[PDB]
Design brief:
The structure is cut from a larger assembly and holds chains A (about 55 residues) and B (about 1100 residues).
Chain A (H helix, E strand, L loop, with lengths): L30 H22 L5
Chain B lengths: L1 E3 L14 H9 L15 H8 L7 E2 L4 E4 L6 H7 L4 E7 L2 E3 L5 E2 L6 E4 L7 E3 L2 E5 L1 E5 L2 E6 L7 E6 L8 E5 L5 E4 L7 H5 L6 H5 L15 H5 L2 H12 L7 H13 L8 H10 L10 E4 L2 E4 L2 H11 L17 E4 L1 H24 L9 H4 L3 H12 L4 E3 L5 H9 E3 L13 H4 L24 E2 L5 E2 L5 E9 L2 E9 L1 H6 L1 E3 L15 E5 L3 E4 L6 E3 L21 H12 L12 E2 L3 H7 L4 E2 L4 E3 L6 E6 L4 E5 L23 E2 L4 E3 L4 E2 L2 E2 L3 E6 L11 E5 L1 H4 L5 E12 L34 E2 L4 E3 L2 E3 L7 H10 L6 E3 L2 E2 L6 E10 L11 E13 L7 E3 L6 E6 L21 H5 L3 H15 L2 E3 L8 H21 L6 H12 L9 H9 L3 E2 L14 E10 L4 H4 L29 H10 L2 H8 L6 H13 ...
Parallel strand pairs in B: 1-49, 10-19, 28-49, 38-48
Antiparallel strand pairs in B: 2-5, 3-4, 4-7, 5-6, 8-9, 9-18, 10-17, 11-12, 12-13, 13-14, 15-16, 19-20, 21-22, 22-23, 22-27, 24-25, 25-26, 29-34, 30-31, 30-33, 31-32, 35-36, 37-51, 39-46, 40-45, 41-44, 42-43, 45-46, 47-51, 50-51
Helix pairs in contact in B: 1-11, 2-11, 7-8, 11-13, 22-23, 24-25
The chains are: A mainly alpha (about 55), B alpha+beta (about 1100).
Organism (chain A): Thermus aquaticus
Function (chain A): DNA-dependent RNA polymerase catalyzes the transcription of DNA into RNA using the four ribonucleoside triphosphates as substrates.
Family (chain A): Belongs to the RNA polymerase beta' chain family.
Chain lengths: ~55, ~1100
């Protein structure tokens, strides 16, 4: 049951959530990339905040 | 010669048909109106409601607003692919309250798109139109509870974005509850600060008895305004702590705020004349002397509780009634979004004040363009009410402009539309067309405005009615709204008149959409014309009385899909509205004043006017439309004849001598032919292709963009590395196709070279490179080549290069090159044809002139339609059109038969008799009697009793002729057809759908990156989607390998399709595939959800579908 509480978070392969430019030079990307990204910012910010000694709040 | 029918003479002409968009957008602009004398409505309403703003101690204010002149004209904006717009400069004075500092200073705002004369805008070089929206009128209303059968729930409501919906509902405790923004609370608790207590709520309030005690709560009535203000602020907004000043400000912004809450002027008026009270402003309550004072709630609770008592005079409102429904026109919408953007700008201003230097700041630094710019940009580009203009023909854009949609933001959607808003209410009569509407999931949602229907200032659609006093009709025409119509009793347009007064004792009338037979003494009104009960396209259907509603709908909708033809002709039998259609469409050139034509040619028609000025009219020749249909103007005037004012000069694509020409007039025979006309299929005589009938011109335009990639700059040039001589022919100098060059699919319109991503040639590849010794060179060929199925001649040439005047190109891109390509399309097998009566059809095989069912004079028929389509669809109008078309073909005159005031059977029969006298008379004048085969057909027609026995063959052929049926000889045999067959002139239409565009097949093309599925649509060179239902079909058949190929090899399976193509190329049988490869994506996606997906084997063991790939 404890597996339902996730420690390591699986990350989908790049070609499944691709980022590629098109005609006109402009780029294109999946929303999953941005989601994963924000998850990463929050996780790393918390990561350094825990080692920081920041207050419980 | 042109003959008119009917006794109903419209006293009033059809009002300007493009007027809704043009006038509404006129009232929301006030360009010519001085900044002093302006109306304070529309854009200036936005200004005055967003200003002044005060929040140190800055005080802003507005002064004026200025319309700029367009930086580029229509055509320029269209071919630059730029929105047609002009700079709007607000002149706004900034002041300081405490300092007394006055720095006035003008400012900018943004770019505002201008509506053209036809009534459409241009966004990003594309002509677009904003459709009118239909919702319910502002005000308050009362309807029985969905939950409770015994009572009536109350509703209060303003304009959208002008503040929230309000619902007064008695819960069943006996207690009352109010609902705004999804929540519950008693009314008294709201009565609160409005200056009411126990006594003031029990005083008058009871004529009731039982209804007074459910209102009262002594716990709330004990506390007084600011305390219960804190209470309601605690309930309705739990987020922030229950402060008193927060409650004050918030609940002031919710109700008493004239800016934040604007109840419609029409809603103001209507609510004022319903509740039996009056209202100062547009606000629900008033903030006065620091305390709130009641406006709305008191009389609406009065009317609520009164109606629920059962006292006379109070009644439930009709929801779908058009008196309770109003139209959002283009100006009101534009102004709405304008004021939204203006609000965002207000917030920007407010943010910019509290920093920097509060002492000296010009309004120039305080104000930004982007909020309003992006607001308007978003509304024009994105919003559902803004859609691509219909350029297929003039009537297309006309009707598209007269279209009324219930969809879009702020309106309703496909899902929440039941039989409520889809149906036809009593009041749709002279306002909304009961027939015209798409035959799709959108039925009843998107409808059209009636011919004589008009929209007033309040957004209420009104319709003309002639007032009649004591049987005597008055020339005074009154435009009345739905309620105003509901009050009076209205007669019919076809009611018999004896020189301006009523004849019959029984007059057809109505009281609120209810047919009643009644005397001339009590009739106060009459219809102007039956035409006002239908839209424009519906009004173009002759003998509409004889056609079923469904096929009439289809008729109009198909008239919208009309493609212009080169030889295109106006119908033989018309309703008479075609003229005004071509006039108000502005697709034709007329004479602005009296004058004389001093020249013609196909470019400039110059006229020397009586006023002395010499004015030339430039003619648009072969201009590409949205759908591709050519827009062309052919002058009909001789050089040197004096024109009147308003007189025609040049026709439109869809015009003939000032008449609407949609399809052409052809000779139809109604009869089965060799099963070729089976299921409404259309056989056609090849003769049409000889006369260039139904030949349409379609210009399709392709563009290309030279950019600078990080690898290197793209360039437009004639030089291409591997290109042979013969393929470079028409490319003359800069690598662009010349004018007038035929381009085959695969041929290069313009050349382009882009440096390839630098990579090695493969060992075999470089072996080849060495063998031929041809230098592997730098750049690779990116050139634009015309897509398959498409091709034609090159007319237009456009090159926009950067570093050159008049053009600003987006970053990174050097130059854009665009080519117009026009195609000549004759009617082909598979093309679509249809009539005004809603008879669809495809061209099924064309027939040579040799074998045709023809007349005794050798005249062949042009179509042969199938009669079996007639009785099911129940459109008899086409039959009459065919009869009158026969008579018209023979006596050489056209006809005008208005809707519901028509030609009749005896009239048509008489015309047939006359035409027969001429025809047979000419037969015997040339020294010919009656043919033997005709005697045969007449004999067998006599036995079945189509003709009176004992009468000579002349009189029997006569009796048969007025029936519309004549003797027909089979061109294949020469033997006559057993029975007589109706023939005549029908007006038939080539429509948008063609085989040329719609035929596509594919073997192996591009595939999507995410999943390996082929792309969709023809434009992408796509494969056909095999749906789930089709899977069910294959499964039902029990074809396992067919379904397998469908699911694996032939669709997305990489190794499968590769090895298969390999096998067929080498002449094998295709192998068995393995992994669909979308399924692997499914597996890894499932693993991304942290779900372990194990593909097992016969014995519960892991089988890895990723081969040495993700194994690790």
């Amino acid at each position: 049951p404890e597996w339902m509480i996730l420690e390591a978070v699986p990350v989908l392969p790049p070609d499944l959530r691709p980022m590629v430019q098109v005609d006109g030079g402009r780029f294109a990307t999946s929303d999953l990339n941005d989601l994963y990204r924000r998850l990463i910012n929050r996780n790393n910010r918390l990561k350094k905040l825990l080692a920081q000694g920041a207050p419980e709040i | 010669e042109i003959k008119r029918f009917g006794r109903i003479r419209e006293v009033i002409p059809l009002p300007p048909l493009t007027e809704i968009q043009v006038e509404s957008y006129k009232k929301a602009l006030q360009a010519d109106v001085p900044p002093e004398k302006r109306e304070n409505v529309g854009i200036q309403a936005a200004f005055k409601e967003t200003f002044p703003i005060e929040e140190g101690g800055l005080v802003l204010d507005f002064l004026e607003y200025r319309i700029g002149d367009p930086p580029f004209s229509q055509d320029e904006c269209r071919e630059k692919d730029l929105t047609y717009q002009a700079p709007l400069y607000a002149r706004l004075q900034l002041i300081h309250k405490d300092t007394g500092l006055i720095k006035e200073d003008e400012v900018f705002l943004g770019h505002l798109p201008l509506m053209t004369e036809d009534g459409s805008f241009i966004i990003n070089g594309a002509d677009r139109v904003i459709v009118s929206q239909i919702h319910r009128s502002p005000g308050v209303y009362f309807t029985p509870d969905p939950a409770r059968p015994g009572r009536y729930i109350a509703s209060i409501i303003p304009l959208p974005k002008r503040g929230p919906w309000i619902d007064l509902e008695v819960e069943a405790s006996g207690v009352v509850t109010m609902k705004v923004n999804k929540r519950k609370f008693p009314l008294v608790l709201l009565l609160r600060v409005l200056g009411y207590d126990q006594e003031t709520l029990v005083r008058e309030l009871s004529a009731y008895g039982d209804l007074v005690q459910g209102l009262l709560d002594e716990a709330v009535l004990a506390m007084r305004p600011e305390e219960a203000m804190v209470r309601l602020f605690t309930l309705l907004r739990p987020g922030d702590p229950p402060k008193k000043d927060k409650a004050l400000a918030y609940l002031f912004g919710l109700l008493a705020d004239p800016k934040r809450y604007d109840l419609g002027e029409a809603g103001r008026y209507k609510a004022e004349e319903k509740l039996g009270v009056g209202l100062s402003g547009r606000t629900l309550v008033r903030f006065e002397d620091g305390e709130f004072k009641d406006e709305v709630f008191l009389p609406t609770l009065r009317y609520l509780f009164a109606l629920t008592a059962g006292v006379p005079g109070h009644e439930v409102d009709d929801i779908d009634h058009l008196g309770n429904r109003r139209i959002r026109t283009v100006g009101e919408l534009m102004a709405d979004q304008f004021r939204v953007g203006l609000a965002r700008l207000a917030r920007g201003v407010r943010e910019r004040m509290v920093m920097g230097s509060p002492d000296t700041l010009t309004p120039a630094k305080l104000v930004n363009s982007r909020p309003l710019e992006a607001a308007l940009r978003e509304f024009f580009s994105r919003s559902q009410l803004s859609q691509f203009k219909d350029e297929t023909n003039p009537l297309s854009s006309l009707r598209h402009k007269r279209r009324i949609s219930a969809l879009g933001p702020g309106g309703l959607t496909r899902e929440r539309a039941g039989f409520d808003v889809r149906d036809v209410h009593r009041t749709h009569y002279g306002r909304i067309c009961p027939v015209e509407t798409p035959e799709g999931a959108n039925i009843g949602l998107i409808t059209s405005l009636a011919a004589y229907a008009r929209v007033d200032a309040l957004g209420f659609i009104r319709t003309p009615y002639r007032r009649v006093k004591n049987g005597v009709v008055t020339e005074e025409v009154v435009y009345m709204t739905a309620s105003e119509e509901d009050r009076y009793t209205i007669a019919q347009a076809n009611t018999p008149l004896e020189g301006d007064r009523i004849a019959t004792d029984r007059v057809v009338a109505r009281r609120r959409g209810e047919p009643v037979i009644v005397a001339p003494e009590e009739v106060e009104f009459m219809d102007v014309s039956p035409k006002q009960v239908f839209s424009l396209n519906t009004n173009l259907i002759p003998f509409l009385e004889h056609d079923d509603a469904n096929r009439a709908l289809m008729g109009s909708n198909m008239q919208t899909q009309a493609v212009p033809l080169i030889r295109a002709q106006a119908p033989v039998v018309m309703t008479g509205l075609e003229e005004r259609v071509v006039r108000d469409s502005l697709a034709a050139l007329y004479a602005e004043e009296d004058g004389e034509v001093v020249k013609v040619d196909g470019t400039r028609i110059a006229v020397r006017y009586e006023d002395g000025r010499l004015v030339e009219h430039p003619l648009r020749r072969y201009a590409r439309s949205n759908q591709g249909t050519a827009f062309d103007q052919r002058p009909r005037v001789r050089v040197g004849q004096r024109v009147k004012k308003g007189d025609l000069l040049a026709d439109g694509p869809a015009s003939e001598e000032g008449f609407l020409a949609l399809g052409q007039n052809v000779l139809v025979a109604i009869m089965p032919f060799d099963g070729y006309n089976f299921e409404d299929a259309i056989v056609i005589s090849e003769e049409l292709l000889k006369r260039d009938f139904y030949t349409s011109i379609h210009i399709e335009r392709y563009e290309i963009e030279a950019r600078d990639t990080k690898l290197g700059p793209e360039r437009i040039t004639r030089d291409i590395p591997h290109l042979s001589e013969a393929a470079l022919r028409d490319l003359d100098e800069e690598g662009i196709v010349r004018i007038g060059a035929e381009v085959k699919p695969g041929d290069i319109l313009v050349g382009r070279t882009s440096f390839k991503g630098e990579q090695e040639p493969s060992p075999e590849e470089r072996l080849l490179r060495s063998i031929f010794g041809e230098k592997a060179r730098d750049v690779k060929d990116t050139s634009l080549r015309v897509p398959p199925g498409e091709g034609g001649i090159v007319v237009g040439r456009l090159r926009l290069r950067r570093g050159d005047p008049g053009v600003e190109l987006k970053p990174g891109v050097r130059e854009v090159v665009r080519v117009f390509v026009a195609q000549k399309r004759k009617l082909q097998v598979g093309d679509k044809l249809a009539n005004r009566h809603g008879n669809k059809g495809v061209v099924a095989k064309i027939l040579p002139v040799e074998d045709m069912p023809h007349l005794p004079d050798g005249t062949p028929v042009d179509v042969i339609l199938n009669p079996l389509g007639v009785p099911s669809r129940m459109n008899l109008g086409q039959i009459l059109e065919t009869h009158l078309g026969l008579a018209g073909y023979f006596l050489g005159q056209r006809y005008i038969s208005p809707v519901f005031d028509g030609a009749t059977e005896p009239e048509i029969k008489e015309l047939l008799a006359e035409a027969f006298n001429l025809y047979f008379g000419k037969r015997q004048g040339e020294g010919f009697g009656v043919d033997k085969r005709e005697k045969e057909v007449l004999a067998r027609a006599e036995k079945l009793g189509l003709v009176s026995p004992g009468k000579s063959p002349e009189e029997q052929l006569k009796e048969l002729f007025d029936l519309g049926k004549v003797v027909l000889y089979d061109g294949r045999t020469g033997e006559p057809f057993e029975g007589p067959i109706v023939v005549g002139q029908m007006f038939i239409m080539k429509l948008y759908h063609m085989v040329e565009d719609k035929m596509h097949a594919r073997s192996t093309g591009p595939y999507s990156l995410i999943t390996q599925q082929p792309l969709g649509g023809k434009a992408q060179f796509g494969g056909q989607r095999f749906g789930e239902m089709e899977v069910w079909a294959l499964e039902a058949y029990g074809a396992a390998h067919t379904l397998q190929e469908m699911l694996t090899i032939k669709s997305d399976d990489i190794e499968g399709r590769n090895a298969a193509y390999q096998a067929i190329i080498k002449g094998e049988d295709v192998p068995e595939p393995s992994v669909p490869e979308s399924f692997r994506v499914l597996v890894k996606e499932l693993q991304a959800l942290a779900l372990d997906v194990q593909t097992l084997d016969e014995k519960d063991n892991p089988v890895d579908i990723f081969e040495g790939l993700a194994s690790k």
